[PDB]
Amino acid sequence: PNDEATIKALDNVIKQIEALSVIVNRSEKADDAQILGPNTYKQLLEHLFS
Amino acid sequence: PTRYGTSESIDKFKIAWENVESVLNMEGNDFVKTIMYAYEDNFPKKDFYMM
Predict the structure, then answer these.
(1) A8 vs B19: CA distance, rounded Å
(2) What 3-state class would DSSP assign to A33?
(3) Cα A4 from Cα B34, distance rounded (Å)
(4) Which of A37, A50, B10, B24 has the fewest Cβ atoms within 10 angstroms?
(5) How many CB atoms lie within 10 A of CB A9?
(6) Where are the alpha helices (DSSP H) in chain B?
(7) Which of B26, B29, B30, B33 to mutate to test the interface with A (most CBs of A within 10 A)?
(8) Measuring CA to CA, how many Å separate A14 from each of A1, A5, B9, B17?
(9) Which domain of life is it from (chain B) (predicted)?
(10) What is the DSSP secondary structure assignment for residue B18, as one 8-state letter?
C-alpha cells in the first residue's frame, strides 16, 4: 500500500466533516402584522328644515 | 459494521465513492483506473466497491 494516499483521504474526509459542522441556521424574518395609520370619519350630506 | 451497510439508500453512495475515486486519481494507479472507467457498463461501481 502507498501510505501517502491514506493520509490524503483522511485529511479530505476530516476537512469535509469540519466544513459540514460549521453551517449555522439563523433566520431573521419580519412579522405579518401591518402598521396602522390615523384616519378621520367623514360627514355625509344632510338637510335640516323646521 | 454497526450502521449504513446493505440497507443504506442509493443516495449515500456519492459520499462513499468519493474517497475511492480520489485514490484512483493519484500517480501509479492509472492502469486500474483506466480499466475501471472503460468498462463501467459490464462491471458497475457498486460491485467494485463491494469487492
Answers:
(1) 9
(2) coil
(3) 21
(4) A50
(5) 16
(6) 13-23, 30-38, 45-50
(7) B26
(8) 21, 14, 23, 16
(9) Viruses
(10) H
Q: What is the resolution of this structure in A?
A: 3.1
Cα separation, B45 vs B47, in Å, equals 6
The grid coordinates of residue A43 equal 360627514
Q: Give the chain A residue nearest B26 (alpha carbons).
A: A5
Among A3, A7, A8, A11, which would you mutate to test the B interface (most chain B Cβ atoms within 10 Å of its Cβ)?
Answer: A8
Which residues from chain B sit within 8 angstroms of residue A3, using beta carbons? none
Method for this entry: cryo-EM
**If we measure between CA atoms, which residue out of B51, B49, B50, B47 comes closest to residue B23?**
B49
Task: Name the grid cell of B8.
Answer: 443504506
- Of residues B8, B16, B23, B9, the one with CA closest to residue B45: B16
